[PDB]
Design a protein around this ligand. Sequence first.
Ligand SMILES: O=C1CCN([C@@H]2O[C@H](COP(=O)(O)O)[C@@H](O)[C@H]2O)C(=O)N1
Ligand SMILES: O=C1CCN([C@@H]2O[C@H](COP(=O)(O)O)[C@@H](O)[C@H]2O)C(=O)N1
Ligand SMILES: O=C1CCN([C@@H]2O[C@H](COP(=O)(O)O)[C@@H](O)[C@H]2O)C(=O)N1
Ligand SMILES: [Mg+2]
Ligand SMILES: [Mg+2]
Lengths: 449, 449, 449
Amino acid sequence: KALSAVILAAGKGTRMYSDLPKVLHTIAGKPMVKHVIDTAHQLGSENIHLIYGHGGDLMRTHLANEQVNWVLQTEQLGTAHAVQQAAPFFKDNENIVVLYGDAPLITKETLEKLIEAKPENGIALLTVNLDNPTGYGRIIRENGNVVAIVEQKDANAEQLNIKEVNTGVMVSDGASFKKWLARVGNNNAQGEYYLTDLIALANQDNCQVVAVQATDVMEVEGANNRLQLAALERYFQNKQASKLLLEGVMIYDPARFDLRGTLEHGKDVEIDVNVIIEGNVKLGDRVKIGTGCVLKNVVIGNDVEIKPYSVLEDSIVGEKAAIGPFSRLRPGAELAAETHVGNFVEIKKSTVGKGSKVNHLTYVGDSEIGSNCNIGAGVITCNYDGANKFKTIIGDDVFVGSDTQLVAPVKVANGATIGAGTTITRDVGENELVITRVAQRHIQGWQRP
Amino acid sequence: KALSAVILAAGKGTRMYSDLPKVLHTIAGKPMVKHVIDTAHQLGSENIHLIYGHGGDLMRTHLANEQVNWVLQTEQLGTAHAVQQAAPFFKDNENIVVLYGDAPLITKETLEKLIEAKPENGIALLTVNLDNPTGYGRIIRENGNVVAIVEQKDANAEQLNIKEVNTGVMVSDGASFKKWLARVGNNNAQGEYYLTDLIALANQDNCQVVAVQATDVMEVEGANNRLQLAALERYFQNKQASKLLLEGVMIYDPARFDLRGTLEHGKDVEIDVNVIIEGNVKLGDRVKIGTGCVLKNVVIGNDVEIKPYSVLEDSIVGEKAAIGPFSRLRPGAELAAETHVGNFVEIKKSTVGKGSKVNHLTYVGDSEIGSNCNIGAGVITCNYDGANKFKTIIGDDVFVGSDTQLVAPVKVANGATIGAGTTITRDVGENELVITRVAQRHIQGWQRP
Amino acid sequence: KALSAVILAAGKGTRMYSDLPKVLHTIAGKPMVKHVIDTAHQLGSENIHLIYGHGGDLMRTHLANEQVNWVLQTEQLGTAHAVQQAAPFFKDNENIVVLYGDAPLITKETLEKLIEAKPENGIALLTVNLDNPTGYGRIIRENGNVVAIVEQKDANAEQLNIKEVNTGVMVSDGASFKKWLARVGNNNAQGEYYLTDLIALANQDNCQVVAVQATDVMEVEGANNRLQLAALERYFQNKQASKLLLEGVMIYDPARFDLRGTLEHGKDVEIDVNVIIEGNVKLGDRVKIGTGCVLKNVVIGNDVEIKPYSVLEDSIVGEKAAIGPFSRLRPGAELAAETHVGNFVEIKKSTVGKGSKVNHLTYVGDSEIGSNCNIGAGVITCNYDGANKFKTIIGDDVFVGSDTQLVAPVKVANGATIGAGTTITRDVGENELVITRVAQRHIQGWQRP
Ligand SMILES: O=C1CCN([C@@H]2O[C@H](COP(=O)(O)O)[C@@H](O)[C@H]2O)C(=O)N1
Ligand SMILES: O=C1CCN([C@@H]2O[C@H](COP(=O)(O)O)[C@@H](O)[C@H]2O)C(=O)N1
Ligand SMILES: O=C1CCN([C@@H]2O[C@H](COP(=O)(O)O)[C@@H](O)[C@H]2O)C(=O)N1
Ligand SMILES: [Mg+2]
Ligand SMILES: [Mg+2]
């Protein structure tokens, strides 16, 4: 049958000490709630009902493009009340899964298992086994079915030893949710309407509740503060790193690797310690990434080595290129095959043709550079004190001597040669040599201090 | 009643294989003994008696400003002998706490609990429970009181199973210390005067010894070598990081964060992996620190982003500034609000006014730069081959073209414009444009190799 | 008696998803098999028989200089078959130890113990105790001798609880190997000739099999994939770091330290977090290495501080030098005592004499620089558009003003002074001052946009 999701996301998250609401804090660069939305989508959810409240404005701005039903809860009166806000939108004959925006690690595979276990007109309850279950509601099984969730304060001595505990994550049909949510009271020490009470109500109705255990305890773990969030982060990164390792990526130390987005990789890729991969990154075969590198939204071709402490964003790098160490590629940097970019070099919104080298102490911006060019140490593209900054066009087989300024807009044609220390303002023709004529004063017998 | 401390700090620390004495090795940038002195002070210690010996010269030079009584022990004849060196200075009716300079993690809270437990004319003994207590003196409790510390070699089979062990940290009144220390012998396999023996002597005198357990085992842990020291370091950093996380600082990975000093922070601060914070650092609200940064003695205003691999020392940065990546701020760097400092830029002992940008491959030293200036790529402040280096003064709304040298002492007035590739030696007036007149040789039909 | 080794190295390593064969994947920069070869050599092995097969070409190119007997196995028919390939080369009266190229952490000390335990005409079997021994062959001891290795599928209930397990690593005499290997069959579910069967055959012959337990479980651990390899890496680095710590090297965090080669060190050396030491590195007394540094094949003298994010290769640095932060030393960089190299500086194949400073935004290549020189910010050595790049020779006590290009081949004699912004093409004489004569256009009342 069909499926829709409810995600509880209304919390203030006081103990985060933040201007953000609780579920917008990021794990691997992505709000916690976004992980849960994505998981709900990948399960095949037809609708995703997002129960929100605190930080409403920020929720709407941060998640504006999410395919969710925005259900604004004016007061937090308990989890059952929250789910009930979405209930008018439940189809009677679809399944509904209830998830929490502050528990981002829940997997599709566990949730498929949960949904699969749900008996007709009944409930599948996600449980977890804890070594110290103190404080949590104990699962009571009779004849394979959950007959009660006994809270800490009610449990007898033997019940307290039960390690299996309620997570609050559950699946039932829309009709059953509508029926049972209407029967939830708030007669308890907290005066709240608890979703937990559906298990009792199902049992009252001679409907079956089946427990499904989460394989990994961390999967169902939520974060109430940034210490807990950091723990989820570490768990998440280690899981990501382990997957890549088993796919054949050499990650020198998986404890010092961060992926904040998606990585596409070839074979024999090597990633040294303290690399951060952000956004959408694609690495070809035999790419080597040295220590300290940051790659954000880049495509790297086969056989590229990126040497240590290089930072790349919104860039493309052709096969057999060599980058770094201490290289900076800014958005729109496009390096062709067999190119060389060296230390203390910055390339912004420029194309660099096959075989060209830019190896030291250089800024190239808003430029086209052709094939087999030699861009000397200290070369700088610049503009007049004007408005909008213009383009520098360098053809093929050009030599630009060290510490030369190229003043845009300017064109240097194929095969041109430019002496060291030159200021280029006028276009340079094909096979034109331009050398600066210096005037020097020479003083003999100048004794230094 | 009053309190004073004795700190045992005389050890050579042979297994550190160092020219330093044992307690001067640092944890979080601070000698181990300094941690203990600070803790003693924060407890309200009136006097702190520092028992020192090996590396006496280095102790005195490294700890010259510490408010301690310098008690020079000419030979190490045991812990009781060490404490006895300070005993003539004990007030009869003050409490004395005995601490060890090679155990820096002991907390004020544990020591307050210890002092609180001390019975009149008796002793409060700090103990710890160990999973493998082999080798350590077993605590024997009879009717809530410590009646004996039974050493490994004396313990019977059931005593050996006791997990509670003596730490040597203890509190008693000054009169009692003076009395009992005089009765300590050295009739044992090591021929040493052990402070441990005070428990027996107290029990001989019908005085009460009460045990107080340390909550955290690591708290009472000492370091005899650099492997053990590294373990204390890691424990200490994790404790610091956890505190910051619970205060609402987002630390992406607390295992890759180091604080070596003090951090003051606002809300919504984010610190990426491999950041080191040294000395006194203050961060405002919504400061973001990218990977690899080092901040030593800096103040950073609200809404500043520091991008990766930036190194800052003895610097001030105004609100909404943007620094990095690959930026270097050296002592005396003062950046106003809304400033921009970019890659491969070094700023030393200079002020940079509101809105100004220094974005590439630049050295600014001993300079004043006003508001809304544009300092081009490759610009360098420099001096004559002289003595003492002089100041470069740049006014407001100045454009300095790329690869220009500013030769101090020189002044560039408001609104001036300087062309690329210029050498500025003479003062530039308000609204003065200075452009270098180049001479070039152009050779047509120059065929490159 | 004499000893030779057999190393099994023929595997494809399918689950590495690599073009390399299994044993060429590196641990600490060295192929797994190379670790094992070195260990075999350090044991005093007379011959080392390398059984290889998959990736034969790559084995031969990657290990071309190894002192091994190359034994090419045309098909993998089991471990006994592999060892039998080398058997014609066994001396009857030498010991043979069998090792696996995919288990690089095995120690000399464990293998000496194993060899020592071997009874005359018998076998010493290396075993390990596992907490979950499921799937592995259980060691059955009767009267101190191994009488059987019972596999998972054959073991009775009590045998399954045995934690001691077969590793496949074993020692016997050459004659005994030749005899028993000829009696190994392949009558089993896998149809393979298992070396394991020698234990049964020895027991058939009334020969003694003695078990020797590995002290460290990880020692005998192999890697079938890159996840397992990463675990071996971490274990290996932690062991290396711990050894250095106990020798008196201050490693701030041993979990963020990598050694890929050999380190020679003096006393009071301090290494901050995220340092990588590669090849052969020698550090003198009181060397301080800041965070993020990479040192490959370098010699560093006493009292040198290398500041953060410096990268050094094939370089020598004299005592009391100061390097970094953001410094790059490329092969052939030789810095004398008391030199200074600063941020965004690159030195390649150059010698720099005592007391000289190169502190900012500079490239020095193919150069000799004498003592007490001052190389200004922005200085660049360069060449003509020619063939082969030539040498720049700078004498003693030379001042080179900022943003000066030195165009090789050129010589600047002792005591010369060069103004800022100069292009040096002609040799500069002793005590010669060279200053560039600039032409400037000054335009008053130029109002900026
Ligand atoms: O009425 C509510 C209750 C709980 N919640 C959210 O559900 C999550 C779990 O609920 P409890 O902390 O009451 O067990 C939590 O993140 C909380 O903020 C709502 O969004 N609305
Ligand atoms: O006479 C002494 C004995 C011990 N000590 C110091 O006290 C600390 C603990 O003493 P023991 O290693 O004997 O248990 C240790 O750091 C040791 O160096 C002295 O300073 N003087
Ligand atoms: O015939 C063989 C069998 C095993 N081996 C190698 O020996 C190692 C251990 O053998 P098993 O995976 O069958 O237990 C493994 O690395 C495998 O590749 C050979 O080189 N040749
Ligand atoms: Mg210049
Ligand atoms: Mg320059």
